[PDB]
Each structure stands twice: as C-alpha cells, then as structure tokens.
Amino acid sequence: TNVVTNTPIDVCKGPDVDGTADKINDKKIHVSQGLKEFQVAKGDRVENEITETADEMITKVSDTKDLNVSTKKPHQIADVP
Amino acid sequence: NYNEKSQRDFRVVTIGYNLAASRQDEFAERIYPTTVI
Amino acid sequence: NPIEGGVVQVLPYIAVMKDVYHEVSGVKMDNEEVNMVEAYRDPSILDDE
Amino acid sequence: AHRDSNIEAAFRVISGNQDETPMYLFCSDKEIANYLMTKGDDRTLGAYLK
Amino acid sequence: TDEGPGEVVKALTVNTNIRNSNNAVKRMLNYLAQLREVVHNGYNRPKFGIIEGALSAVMRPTYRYKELDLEKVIDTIKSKDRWDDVCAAILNCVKAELFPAHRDSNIEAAFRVISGNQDETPMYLFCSDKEIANYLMTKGDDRTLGAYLK
C-alpha cells in the first residue's frame, strides 16, 4: 500500500471517443477560429510582460528610517564553566 | 499544432525595491550626533 | 497554474550612474551603472568632488 | 561572508522591513546533523543571526 | 513630460544621507591617522593648534595603536571554550590599553570641569564592523570595565 501526502493529482478521464461513425449534416457548414486556444493573446498583447514603467515599480524611497539598525536586543551568551 | 504548451504567458512577480536612509545611521549618529545649524 | 507553465521575475532598482558623455569612437558606454543597494556596503560609489 | 556580502541590505531593500536579517539553514547529512542538533531553542549565531 | 516620479525623486535625499554616514567614517579614520601623528610626535601636554578638537587644549592628547593578531593573543585549551576565549582576548586587550590611557589622559578632569557635574563618568563606544561586533555584543551584558567605566 502507498501513501501520498499533500500532493494534488490531476487524473485524466481519458477520451469519450467511442468507435462509432456518426453521420453529420454538412449541407451548410460554418467554421470560425478564435485566437483563444493559442494563448497568443488573452485580451491584450502583453498582460504578463511588464505593464508599468520602471519608475512605477519603485515602491518606497524613504528619507527617514535607515536600513542599518543592529538588532536592538543583542542575544547574550552565558559563561561556560 | 497537435500539441500546445504555455510559452507566451507566465506568472509575473515584481520584486520589491525599498530604499531608506536617515540623516545619519546609528553608527555615525552616535559618534557624530546631529546638530541643526 | 498549468496554463502558466513558468514564472517571470522583474527586478526594478535605482542606479547610480557616472555622468559621462558618449565617446565618438567608443565601443561601449563608459558609464559606471551600479545599484544604489551597493552603496550600503561600499558608499564610496557615491563620492563626488 | 555576512559582512563581505550585502545580503543583509538586500533583504531589507527587497522586503521593506528595516528590521530584517536572513536566517541560515544548516543543510547536512544524517551523520553531521546529529552533531549540530545539540543546542536548544537558542539556534543563534553571534548576537542576532538565527 | 508633466508627471515626475513619485518615489524616485526622494532618492536624491537617500544618496545624500548615505554620503553623510560615509563622510563620518572617512573623517573618523582620517582624524585617527592625524591623531597618531600628533601623539607619536611626542605631544602629550595640552596645547592649542596641534590637532583638531577644541578640547585638545584641555586634556592630554592620547592615542594607542595595537594590532591584535589573535593567533598570538589568545590563550585557549579546548574548543568548548573557544568563543569565550576569542571574546575575552579582544575585550581584555581593550581593557589593558584603556585603563592606562584613561589614567594618562585628563578625560575625567575635563568632563568634570566642563559639564559641571562633580562626578561624571565618560562612556566609551566600541566602534567596530559587523564581524567584530558579533563577538563583543554577545558578552556585552555587563557593560562595565574594571570598577566604574561604562
């Protein structure tokens, strides 16, 4: 027996293809192709690639606090006898 | 194109960038305390 | 997500650039572009006299 | 190595927390790990590193 | 353009603020070099015009330079004690030079006559980099050197 922990599995159903030949009405037929299956675009050409400017991805530039603060509480070590 | 795999669109993560500096840091401030002139 | 199949990491920063002109015969741009972050360990990159 | 590199600043500039230091992982095999796992909850290096 | 960067403009101050701290370090190290020259030259009594510092006319100029090559300084027997032996060797070297330099100088006389406090003890700062401080801070709970120095 096996146990799998914390792993999501996608179990493919497999096909519903059958081995039946269905006649179709093809008197008139219409075919269209949308640019969806290609993931070429899903609304706009670059939804992923940087949409903001470099300047707008700068989050904070403070002039108050300083990023050099040694931990206010220094861990102390007791003597070893 | 029998097979299709994602290459055009990826998850995009922006790395934070946060600068800060005081008039002096603690090292310089303790040695050279700031006096306003 | 299976639809994504990968990740892109975007790294913004502010660079401290030496004020240099473009050499008419230059192969590259002789302009020391360094991240401001480097100034925390080596502030000398900011020196100007 | 913590001094020579600027990782301390790198984490603070990326995370935005002026009180931030990296935590180090001792990645070891089973033999070595038994020699490292002798300290209590005080998994401290120096004054502030964990 | 009309719209300036919201945050990048503030980098002008951050640049200056970092340079402020760096200038403090340069001035400290440059002053110490100048101090070495003046004390080495044989200037021991107070005088006006020998060194920067308005109190150099008050107290005896004093300077000690010691090179701690720890292999030749530490006494250690076994690794269990190595941390305390490294920390103690460095701190004891400071004590060894600090006590006679604190005696030879007039710091206590200058501080007591200038501040007006009949008995005010100066505090000494251990100015170091991260590597050295990581050793001294772990044993800095006592904060006291000898009898009454903080």
Terminal C-alpha separation, chain E: 58
Q: Which two tokens stand for residue E89?
A: 């060797």
Residue A38 and residue E8: Cα distance in Å, rounded? 39
Residue E61 and residue A66: Cα distance in Å, rounded? 34
Full DSSP string of A60-81: EEESSS-S----SSPPP-----
Residue E56 and residue A29: Cα distance in Å, rounded? 102
The letter for the amino acid at E26 is K
Residue D14 and residue B16: Cα distance in Å, rounded? 5
Residue E5 and residue C23: Cα distance in Å, rounded? 29
Q: Which two tokens stand for residue E13?
A: 């101050």
Residue with the two structure tokens 């030879």: E104
In residues, how long is chain E? 150
Residue E56 and residue E58: Cα distance in Å, rounded? 5
Instruction: Sort B12 into a burial class: Cβ within 10 Å, 0-12 / 13-18 / 19+.
Output: middle
| Residues D13/A56, Cβ–Cβ less than 8 Å | no
Instruction: Sort D20 into a burial class: Cβ within 10 Å, 0-12 / 13-18 / 19+.
Output: middle
CA–chain centroid gap for D29, Å, is 18
DSSP E149: B
Structural determination approach:
cryo-EM
Residue E103 and residue B5: Cα distance in Å, rounded? 79
Show residues of chain C in contact with E11, CB under 8 Å.
14, 36
Judged by DSSP in three states, C10 sits in strand
Instruction: Sort B19 into a burial class: Cβ within 10 Å, 0-12 / 13-18 / 19+.
Output: buried
Bridge pairing between strands B11-14 and C7-10: parallel
List helix spans (H) across C1-49: none
Residue B16 and residue B2: Cα distance in Å, rounded? 40
Backbone phi, then psi, for B31, in 5-degree steps?
-80, -45
| Residues A68/C40, Cβ–Cβ less than 8 Å | yes
Show residues of chain E in contact with B24, CB under 8 Å.
17, 20-21, 24
Judged by DSSP in three states, E50 sits in coil
Residue A63 and residue D45: Cα distance in Å, rounded? 31
How far CA E23 is from CA of A65, D2, E37, E56, in Å, comes to: 19, 23, 21, 22
Per-window interface: B 4-23 vs A, CB < 8 A: 4, 6, 8-12, 14, 16-22
Residues in Cβ contact with E130 at an 8 Å cutoff, skipping those fewer than 6 apart: D2, D3, D8
Interface test with B, best of D14, D19, D48 (most B CBs within 10 A): D14
CA–chain centroid gap for E90, Å, is 14
Backbone phi, then psi, for A60, in 5-degree steps?
-140, 140
Residue with the two structure tokens 């940087």: A50
Given in angstroms, what resolution was this structure solved at? 3.5
Which H or E element spans position E38? helix E11-41
Residue A14 and residue D4: Cα distance in Å, rounded? 57
Residue E64 and residue E62: Cα distance in Å, rounded? 7
Residue C37 and residue B18: Cα distance in Å, rounded? 10
> Do C46 and E11 count as a contact with CB atoms less than 8 A apart?
no
Partners of C16 in beta bridges: C34
Maximum separation of any 2 CA atoms in chain D, in Å: 39
Q: Which of A65, D14, D33 is nearest to B26 (CA)?
A: A65
Q: Which two tokens stand for residue B3?
A: 């097979």
DSSP D18: S
> Do A49 and C40 count as a contact with CB atoms less than 8 A apart?
no
Where are any strands of DSSP class E within A3-65? 60-62
